[PDB]
Amino acid sequence: QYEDGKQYTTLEKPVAGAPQVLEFFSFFCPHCYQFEEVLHISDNVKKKLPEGVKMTKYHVNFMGGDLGKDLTQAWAVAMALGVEDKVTVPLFEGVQKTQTIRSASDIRDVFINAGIKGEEYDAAWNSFVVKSLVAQQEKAAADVQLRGVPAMFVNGKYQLNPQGMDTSNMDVFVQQYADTVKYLSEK
Ligand SMILES: CCN(CCn1cccn1)C(=O)Cc1ccc(Oc2ccc(C#N)c(C)c2)cc1
């Protein structure tokens, strides 16, 4: 019922030490926007996972021109301050809905409006921790030879394949997605 090539793919040369469940997204990615706002893929996947399992989510550089790099660093700041849940929706909307995010200054305005003090954003932005998080996200994408988003990898061996699942019903799709990750995490 869970055959290889249908719900998932397998990496030709796995990545040792990868997180158990790794999501790659871009704030420019049309389907990543749905995955956040309409499907809630991350929340629904976490719900089907054993309670002692961490999920990791990384931003990618290769969409959005120069802004893709700035958003990857801003996402690193978000991870460093632990404010992902305060900035995810206004970044998605500013980039894709209203298209009001066109510079690094615009990203910063989102964080300030979300309650992060301007000076603390800047200090995080220029910190060694954020430098290292940026490196981590880029290495993770290179390690799996990531070509596009959204993507989810399980134990650095298995790559989810949403296009082999049933996509005519949003809620059936999300259930098949979350159930496929639980299966794969059990491998
Ligand atoms: C990595 C490739 N990639 C980018 C380029 N690309 C491919 C097709 C369109 N763009 C993806 O987007 C991959 C993809 C993801 C999901 C998915 O299925 C659904 C999406 C939204 C909803 C809703 N709401 C439903 C119900 C299903 C289909 C495909």
Side-chain angles (χ1 to χ4, degrees), residues 1-2 4-5 7-11 14-45 49-50 52-53 55-116 118-138 140-146 148-156 158-185 187:
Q1 184 233 349
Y2 267 119
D4 179 288
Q7 295 86 356
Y8 64 72
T9 41
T10 312
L11 290 166
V15 54
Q20 319 168 42
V21 178
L22 179 53
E23 294 186 283
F24 289 96
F25 78 110
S26 174
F27 281 117
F28 280 89
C29 163
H31 277 154
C32 306
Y33 187 103
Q34 298 216 272
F35 275 29
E36 180 55 38
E37 282 211 11
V38 169
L39 301 181
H40 305 282
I41 285 280
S42 297
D43 295 332
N44 278 293
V45 164
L49 287 177
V53 172
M55 297 166 64
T56 316
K57 176 130 82 195
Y58 286 163
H59 195 275
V60 300
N61 297 332
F62 49 80
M63 303 189 66
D66 198 32
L67 265 174
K69 286 72 200 284
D70 286 330
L71 287 164
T72 299
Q73 185 164 353
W75 188 247
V77 168
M79 286 183 288
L81 309 188
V83 293
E84 300 95 324
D85 294 347
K86 300 169 185 169
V87 299
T88 288
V89 173
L91 290 171
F92 265 120
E93 304 210 325
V95 171
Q96 287 188 48
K97 193 190 197 224
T98 62
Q99 294 191 346
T100 38
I101 296 180
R102 307 208 202 255
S103 64
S105 204
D106 296 334
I107 300 161
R108 184 171 179 280
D109 290 334
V110 165
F111 280 71
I112 296 177
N113 292 299
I116 294 87
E119 302 71 10
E120 184 70 3
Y121 183 88
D122 297 333
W125 181 272
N126 293 291
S127 71
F128 178 85
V129 159
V130 161
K131 188 187 302 316
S132 296
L133 287 175
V134 161
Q136 244 193 319
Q137 298 175 85
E138 291 169 351
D143 274 358
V144 302
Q145 307 185 43
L146 190 66
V149 284
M152 184 184 288
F153 297 82
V154 185
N155 288 315
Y158 302 116
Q159 174 171 349
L160 277 293
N161 173 44
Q163 271 151 322
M165 289 135 65
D166 290 308
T167 57
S168 40
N169 180 297
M170 292 180 185
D171 296 299
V172 159
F173 172 71
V174 172
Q175 165 266 124
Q176 299 195 348
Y177 202 95
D179 285 4
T180 304
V181 180
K182 173 195 220 134
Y183 172 82
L184 286 172
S185 81
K187 289 253 266 223

PDB file of all heavy atoms in Angstrom, residues 108-136, unseen atoms left out:
ATOM      1  N   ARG A 108      12.673  43.280   7.521  1.00  0.00           N
ATOM      2  CA  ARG A 108      12.890  43.799   8.865  1.00  0.00           C
ATOM      3  C   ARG A 108      11.624  44.435   9.429  1.00  0.00           C
ATOM      4  O   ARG A 108      11.305  44.259  10.612  1.00  0.00           O
ATOM      5  CB  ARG A 108      14.035  44.812   8.825  1.00  0.00           C
ATOM      6  CG  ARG A 108      14.464  45.381  10.146  1.00  0.00           C
ATOM      7  CD  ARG A 108      15.762  46.199   9.956  1.00  0.00           C
ATOM      8  NE  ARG A 108      16.231  46.795  11.203  1.00  0.00           N
ATOM      9  CZ  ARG A 108      15.742  47.913  11.735  1.00  0.00           C
ATOM     10  NH1 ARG A 108      14.760  48.570  11.132  1.00  0.00           N
ATOM     11  NH2 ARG A 108      16.229  48.374  12.880  1.00  0.00           N
ATOM     12  N   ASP A 109      10.909  45.204   8.601  1.00  0.00           N
ATOM     13  CA  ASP A 109       9.656  45.811   9.040  1.00  0.00           C
ATOM     14  C   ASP A 109       8.663  44.757   9.520  1.00  0.00           C
ATOM     15  O   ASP A 109       7.942  44.979  10.499  1.00  0.00           O
ATOM     16  CB  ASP A 109       9.044  46.638   7.908  1.00  0.00           C
ATOM     17  CG  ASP A 109       9.834  47.901   7.604  1.00  0.00           C
ATOM     18  OD1 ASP A 109      10.527  48.412   8.507  1.00  0.00           O
ATOM     19  OD2 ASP A 109       9.742  48.386   6.453  1.00  0.00           O
ATOM     20  N   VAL A 110       8.615  43.600   8.853  1.00  0.00           N
ATOM     21  CA  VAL A 110       7.717  42.528   9.294  1.00  0.00           C
ATOM     22  C   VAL A 110       8.077  42.073  10.703  1.00  0.00           C
ATOM     23  O   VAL A 110       7.203  41.902  11.565  1.00  0.00           O
ATOM     24  CB  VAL A 110       7.742  41.348   8.308  1.00  0.00           C
ATOM     25  CG1 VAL A 110       7.114  40.110   8.960  1.00  0.00           C
ATOM     26  CG2 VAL A 110       6.989  41.698   7.029  1.00  0.00           C
ATOM     27  N   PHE A 111       9.370  41.859  10.960  1.00  0.00           N
ATOM     28  CA  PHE A 111       9.790  41.417  12.288  1.00  0.00           C
ATOM     29  C   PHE A 111       9.473  42.465  13.346  1.00  0.00           C
ATOM     30  O   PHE A 111       9.031  42.125  14.448  1.00  0.00           O
ATOM     31  CB  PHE A 111      11.285  41.100  12.299  1.00  0.00           C
ATOM     32  CG  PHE A 111      11.633  39.749  11.735  1.00  0.00           C
ATOM     33  CD1 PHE A 111      11.525  39.500  10.377  1.00  0.00           C
ATOM     34  CD2 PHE A 111      12.097  38.737  12.562  1.00  0.00           C
ATOM     35  CE1 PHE A 111      11.873  38.266   9.849  1.00  0.00           C
ATOM     36  CE2 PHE A 111      12.461  37.503  12.040  1.00  0.00           C
ATOM     37  CZ  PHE A 111      12.339  37.265  10.681  1.00  0.00           C
ATOM     38  N   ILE A 112       9.701  43.745  13.032  1.00  0.00           N
ATOM     39  CA  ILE A 112       9.415  44.805  13.994  1.00  0.00           C
ATOM     40  C   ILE A 112       7.921  44.873  14.284  1.00  0.00           C
ATOM     41  O   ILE A 112       7.508  45.010  15.440  1.00  0.00           O
ATOM     42  CB  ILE A 112       9.954  46.157  13.489  1.00  0.00           C
ATOM     43  CG1 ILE A 112      11.481  46.113  13.373  1.00  0.00           C
ATOM     44  CG2 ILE A 112       9.573  47.281  14.448  1.00  0.00           C
ATOM     45  CD1 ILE A 112      12.084  47.392  12.818  1.00  0.00           C
ATOM     46  N   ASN A 113       7.089  44.785  13.243  1.00  0.00           N
ATOM     47  CA  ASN A 113       5.644  44.808  13.460  1.00  0.00           C
ATOM     48  C   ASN A 113       5.178  43.579  14.224  1.00  0.00           C
ATOM     49  O   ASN A 113       4.153  43.636  14.910  1.00  0.00           O
ATOM     50  CB  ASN A 113       4.888  44.925  12.130  1.00  0.00           C
ATOM     51  CG  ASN A 113       5.093  46.272  11.453  1.00  0.00           C
ATOM     52  OD1 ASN A 113       4.753  47.319  12.006  1.00  0.00           O
ATOM     53  ND2 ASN A 113       5.626  46.248  10.237  1.00  0.00           N
ATOM     54  N   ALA A 114       5.919  42.472  14.139  1.00  0.00           N
ATOM     55  CA  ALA A 114       5.586  41.259  14.878  1.00  0.00           C
ATOM     56  C   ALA A 114       6.116  41.265  16.309  1.00  0.00           C
ATOM     57  O   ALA A 114       5.934  40.271  17.022  1.00  0.00           O
ATOM     58  CB  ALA A 114       6.113  40.027  14.136  1.00  0.00           C
ATOM     59  N   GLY A 115       6.777  42.341  16.740  1.00  0.00           N
ATOM     60  CA  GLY A 115       7.206  42.496  18.118  1.00  0.00           C
ATOM     61  C   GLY A 115       8.691  42.335  18.364  1.00  0.00           C
ATOM     62  O   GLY A 115       9.134  42.537  19.505  1.00  0.00           O
ATOM     63  N   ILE A 116       9.477  41.966  17.357  1.00  0.00           N
ATOM     64  CA  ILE A 116      10.919  41.845  17.535  1.00  0.00           C
ATOM     65  C   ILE A 116      11.531  43.238  17.444  1.00  0.00           C
ATOM     66  O   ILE A 116      11.329  43.956  16.456  1.00  0.00           O
ATOM     67  CB  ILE A 116      11.532  40.885  16.496  1.00  0.00           C
ATOM     68  CG1 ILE A 116      11.034  39.443  16.714  1.00  0.00           C
ATOM     69  CG2 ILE A 116      13.079  40.912  16.588  1.00  0.00           C
ATOM     70  CD1 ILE A 116       9.725  39.097  16.022  1.00  0.00           C
ATOM     71  N   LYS A 117      12.254  43.635  18.485  1.00  0.00           N
ATOM     72  CA  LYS A 117      12.865  44.959  18.532  1.00  0.00           C
ATOM     73  C   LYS A 117      13.866  45.127  17.394  1.00  0.00           C
ATOM     74  O   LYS A 117      14.651  44.221  17.098  1.00  0.00           O
ATOM     75  CB  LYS A 117      13.550  45.161  19.890  1.00  0.00           C
ATOM     76  CG  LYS A 117      13.842  46.609  20.247  1.00  0.00           C
ATOM     77  N   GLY A 118      13.826  46.300  16.751  1.00  0.00           N
ATOM     78  CA  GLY A 118      14.662  46.526  15.579  1.00  0.00           C
ATOM     79  C   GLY A 118      16.123  46.223  15.836  1.00  0.00           C
ATOM     80  O   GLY A 118      16.778  45.549  15.036  1.00  0.00           O
ATOM     81  N   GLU A 119      16.635  46.670  16.985  1.00  0.00           N
ATOM     82  CA  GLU A 119      18.036  46.457  17.322  1.00  0.00           C
ATOM     83  C   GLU A 119      18.338  44.985  17.562  1.00  0.00           C
ATOM     84  O   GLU A 119      19.439  44.523  17.242  1.00  0.00           O
ATOM     85  CB  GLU A 119      18.412  47.280  18.552  1.00  0.00           C
ATOM     86  CG  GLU A 119      18.192  48.789  18.434  1.00  0.00           C
ATOM     87  CD  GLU A 119      16.720  49.198  18.432  1.00  0.00           C
ATOM     88  OE1 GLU A 119      15.844  48.348  18.712  1.00  0.00           O
ATOM     89  OE2 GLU A 119      16.441  50.383  18.151  1.00  0.00           O
ATOM     90  N   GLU A 120      17.389  44.236  18.132  1.00  0.00           N
ATOM     91  CA  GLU A 120      17.633  42.818  18.368  1.00  0.00           C
ATOM     92  C   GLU A 120      17.641  42.043  17.057  1.00  0.00           C
ATOM     93  O   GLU A 120      18.464  41.138  16.874  1.00  0.00           O
ATOM     94  CB  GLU A 120      16.594  42.252  19.349  1.00  0.00           C
ATOM     95  CG  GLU A 120      16.815  40.782  19.744  1.00  0.00           C
ATOM     96  CD  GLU A 120      18.043  40.543  20.638  1.00  0.00           C
ATOM     97  OE1 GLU A 120      18.726  41.523  21.036  1.00  0.00           O
ATOM     98  OE2 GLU A 120      18.321  39.360  20.949  1.00  0.00           O
ATOM     99  N   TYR A 121      16.736  42.388  16.131  1.00  0.00           N
ATOM    100  CA  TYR A 121      16.802  41.843  14.777  1.00  0.00           C
ATOM    101  C   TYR A 121      18.177  42.059  14.158  1.00  0.00           C
ATOM    102  O   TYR A 121      18.780  41.131  13.607  1.00  0.00           O
ATOM    103  CB  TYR A 121      15.736  42.490  13.889  1.00  0.00           C
ATOM    104  CG  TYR A 121      15.690  41.924  12.478  1.00  0.00           C
ATOM    105  CD1 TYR A 121      14.914  40.811  12.188  1.00  0.00           C
ATOM    106  CD2 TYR A 121      16.424  42.503  11.439  1.00  0.00           C
ATOM    107  CE1 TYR A 121      14.863  40.283  10.916  1.00  0.00           C
ATOM    108  CE2 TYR A 121      16.390  41.977  10.156  1.00  0.00           C
ATOM    109  CZ  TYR A 121      15.594  40.866   9.903  1.00  0.00           C
ATOM    110  OH  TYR A 121      15.533  40.328   8.641  1.00  0.00           O
ATOM    111  N   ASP A 122      18.676  43.294  14.218  1.00  0.00           N
ATOM    112  CA  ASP A 122      19.950  43.607  13.577  1.00  0.00           C
ATOM    113  C   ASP A 122      21.094  42.843  14.224  1.00  0.00           C
ATOM    114  O   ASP A 122      21.955  42.296  13.524  1.00  0.00           O
ATOM    115  CB  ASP A 122      20.218  45.110  13.645  1.00  0.00           C
ATOM    116  CG  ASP A 122      19.184  45.918  12.886  1.00  0.00           C
ATOM    117  OD1 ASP A 122      18.584  45.380  11.924  1.00  0.00           O
ATOM    118  OD2 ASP A 122      18.969  47.095  13.246  1.00  0.00           O
ATOM    119  N   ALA A 123      21.119  42.800  15.559  1.00  0.00           N
ATOM    120  CA  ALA A 123      22.155  42.050  16.263  1.00  0.00           C
ATOM    121  C   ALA A 123      22.094  40.565  15.920  1.00  0.00           C
ATOM    122  O   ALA A 123      23.123  39.944  15.639  1.00  0.00           O
ATOM    123  CB  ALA A 123      22.028  42.271  17.770  1.00  0.00           C
ATOM    124  N   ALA A 124      20.895  39.975  15.912  1.00  0.00           N
ATOM    125  CA  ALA A 124      20.778  38.599  15.447  1.00  0.00           C
ATOM    126  C   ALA A 124      21.253  38.476  14.001  1.00  0.00           C
ATOM    127  O   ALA A 124      22.004  37.558  13.655  1.00  0.00           O
ATOM    128  CB  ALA A 124      19.323  38.118  15.573  1.00  0.00           C
ATOM    129  N   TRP A 125      20.818  39.400  13.142  1.00  0.00           N
ATOM    130  CA  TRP A 125      21.154  39.331  11.719  1.00  0.00           C
ATOM    131  C   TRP A 125      22.655  39.186  11.512  1.00  0.00           C
ATOM    132  O   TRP A 125      23.104  38.389  10.676  1.00  0.00           O
ATOM    133  CB  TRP A 125      20.633  40.584  11.005  1.00  0.00           C
ATOM    134  CG  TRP A 125      20.891  40.656   9.513  1.00  0.00           C
ATOM    135  CD1 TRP A 125      22.001  41.156   8.887  1.00  0.00           C
ATOM    136  CD2 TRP A 125      19.992  40.254   8.468  1.00  0.00           C
ATOM    137  NE1 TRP A 125      21.859  41.063   7.524  1.00  0.00           N
ATOM    138  CE2 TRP A 125      20.631  40.516   7.241  1.00  0.00           C
ATOM    139  CE3 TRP A 125      18.717  39.689   8.456  1.00  0.00           C
ATOM    140  CZ2 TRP A 125      20.038  40.232   6.015  1.00  0.00           C
ATOM    141  CZ3 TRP A 125      18.123  39.404   7.236  1.00  0.00           C
ATOM    142  CH2 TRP A 125      18.785  39.675   6.032  1.00  0.00           C
ATOM    143  N   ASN A 126      23.444  39.935  12.283  1.00  0.00           N
ATOM    144  CA  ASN A 126      24.894  39.983  12.149  1.00  0.00           C
ATOM    145  C   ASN A 126      25.614  39.022  13.085  1.00  0.00           C
ATOM    146  O   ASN A 126      26.839  39.109  13.225  1.00  0.00           O
ATOM    147  CB  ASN A 126      25.395  41.407  12.400  1.00  0.00           C
ATOM    148  CG  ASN A 126      24.947  42.377  11.331  1.00  0.00           C
ATOM    149  OD1 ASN A 126      25.397  42.306  10.187  1.00  0.00           O
ATOM    150  ND2 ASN A 126      24.059  43.294  11.696  1.00  0.00           N
ATOM    151  N   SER A 127      24.894  38.111  13.724  1.00  0.00           N
ATOM    152  CA  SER A 127      25.494  37.254  14.735  1.00  0.00           C
ATOM    153  C   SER A 127      26.141  36.025  14.106  1.00  0.00           C
ATOM    154  O   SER A 127      25.802  35.605  12.994  1.00  0.00           O
ATOM    155  CB  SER A 127      24.441  36.797  15.743  1.00  0.00           C
ATOM    156  OG  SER A 127      23.562  35.855  15.134  1.00  0.00           O
ATOM    157  N   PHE A 128      27.047  35.417  14.871  1.00  0.00           N
ATOM    158  CA  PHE A 128      27.671  34.163  14.463  1.00  0.00           C
ATOM    159  C   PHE A 128      26.655  33.029  14.399  1.00  0.00           C
ATOM    160  O   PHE A 128      26.758  32.145  13.540  1.00  0.00           O
ATOM    161  CB  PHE A 128      28.792  33.795  15.433  1.00  0.00           C
ATOM    162  CG  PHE A 128      29.464  32.492  15.106  1.00  0.00           C
ATOM    163  CD1 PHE A 128      30.498  32.443  14.176  1.00  0.00           C
ATOM    164  CD2 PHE A 128      29.059  31.315  15.717  1.00  0.00           C
ATOM    165  CE1 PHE A 128      31.120  31.244  13.868  1.00  0.00           C
ATOM    166  CE2 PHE A 128      29.673  30.113  15.412  1.00  0.00           C
ATOM    167  CZ  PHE A 128      30.706  30.076  14.487  1.00  0.00           C
ATOM    168  N   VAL A 129      25.690  33.017  15.322  1.00  0.00           N
ATOM    169  CA  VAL A 129      24.674  31.969  15.303  1.00  0.00           C
ATOM    170  C   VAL A 129      23.913  31.992  13.985  1.00  0.00           C
ATOM    171  O   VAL A 129      23.664  30.942  13.379  1.00  0.00           O
ATOM    172  CB  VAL A 129      23.725  32.110  16.508  1.00  0.00           C
ATOM    173  CG1 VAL A 129      22.412  31.394  16.237  1.00  0.00           C
ATOM    174  CG2 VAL A 129      24.385  31.570  17.768  1.00  0.00           C
ATOM    175  N   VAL A 130      23.539  33.186  13.512  1.00  0.00           N
ATOM    176  CA  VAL A 130      22.773  33.279  12.268  1.00  0.00           C
ATOM    177  C   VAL A 130      23.655  32.952  11.071  1.00  0.00           C
ATOM    178  O   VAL A 130      23.216  32.288  10.121  1.00  0.00           O
ATOM    179  CB  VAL A 130      22.113  34.666  12.141  1.00  0.00           C
ATOM    180  CG1 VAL A 130      21.703  34.966  10.689  1.00  0.00           C
ATOM    181  CG2 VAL A 130      20.895  34.732  13.055  1.00  0.00           C
ATOM    182  N   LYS A 131      24.914  33.402  11.096  1.00  0.00           N
ATOM    183  CA  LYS A 131      25.868  32.978  10.077  1.00  0.00           C
ATOM    184  C   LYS A 131      25.899  31.461   9.970  1.00  0.00           C
ATOM    185  O   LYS A 131      25.818  30.901   8.872  1.00  0.00           O
ATOM    186  CB  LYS A 131      27.274  33.518  10.396  1.00  0.00           C
ATOM    187  CG  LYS A 131      28.275  33.266   9.271  1.00  0.00           C
ATOM    188  CD  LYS A 131      29.712  33.649   9.677  1.00  0.00           C
ATOM    189  CE  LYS A 131      29.786  35.111  10.082  1.00  0.00           C
ATOM    190  NZ  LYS A 131      29.030  35.975   9.124  1.00  0.00           N
ATOM    191  N   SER A 132      25.991  30.777  11.115  1.00  0.00           N
ATOM    192  CA  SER A 132      26.042  29.317  11.112  1.00  0.00           C
ATOM    193  C   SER A 132      24.717  28.689  10.675  1.00  0.00           C
ATOM    194  O   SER A 132      24.727  27.655   9.996  1.00  0.00           O
ATOM    195  CB  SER A 132      26.437  28.808  12.496  1.00  0.00           C
ATOM    196  OG  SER A 132      27.746  29.233  12.836  1.00  0.00           O
ATOM    197  N   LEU A 133      23.572  29.277  11.048  1.00  0.00           N
ATOM    198  CA  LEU A 133      22.293  28.719  10.589  1.00  0.00           C
ATOM    199  C   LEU A 133      22.154  28.831   9.077  1.00  0.00           C
ATOM    200  O   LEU A 133      21.675  27.898   8.419  1.00  0.00           O
ATOM    201  CB  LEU A 133      21.113  29.409  11.282  1.00  0.00           C
ATOM    202  CG  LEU A 133      20.927  29.020  12.752  1.00  0.00           C
ATOM    203  CD1 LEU A 133      19.819  29.837  13.419  1.00  0.00           C
ATOM    204  CD2 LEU A 133      20.647  27.521  12.861  1.00  0.00           C
ATOM    205  N   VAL A 134      22.564  29.971   8.510  1.00  0.00           N
ATOM    206  CA  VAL A 134      22.566  30.133   7.061  1.00  0.00           C
ATOM    207  C   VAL A 134      23.392  29.029   6.410  1.00  0.00           C
ATOM    208  O   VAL A 134      22.955  28.387   5.448  1.00  0.00           O
ATOM    209  CB  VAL A 134      23.097  31.531   6.684  1.00  0.00           C
ATOM    210  CG1 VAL A 134      23.551  31.567   5.226  1.00  0.00           C
ATOM    211  CG2 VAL A 134      22.018  32.578   6.942  1.00  0.00           C
ATOM    212  N   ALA A 135      24.607  28.799   6.921  1.00  0.00           N
ATOM    213  CA  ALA A 135      25.421  27.697   6.415  1.00  0.00           C
ATOM    214  C   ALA A 135      24.681  26.364   6.510  1.00  0.00           C
ATOM    215  O   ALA A 135      24.655  25.587   5.552  1.00  0.00           O
ATOM    216  CB  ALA A 135      26.741  27.624   7.176  1.00  0.00           C
ATOM    217  N   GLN A 136      24.082  26.079   7.668  1.00  0.00           N
ATOM    218  CA  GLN A 136      23.394  24.803   7.857  1.00  0.00           C
ATOM    219  C   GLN A 136      22.309  24.593   6.804  1.00  0.00           C
ATOM    220  O   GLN A 136      22.225  23.523   6.186  1.00  0.00           O
ATOM    221  CB  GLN A 136      22.798  24.737   9.262  1.00  0.00           C
ATOM    222  CG  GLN A 136      23.398  23.643  10.123  1.00  0.00           C
ATOM    223  CD  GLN A 136      22.598  23.386  11.384  1.00  0.00           C
ATOM    224  OE1 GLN A 136      22.127  24.319  12.038  1.00  0.00           O
ATOM    225  NE2 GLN A 136      22.438  22.114  11.733  1.00  0.00           N
TER     226      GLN A 136
END
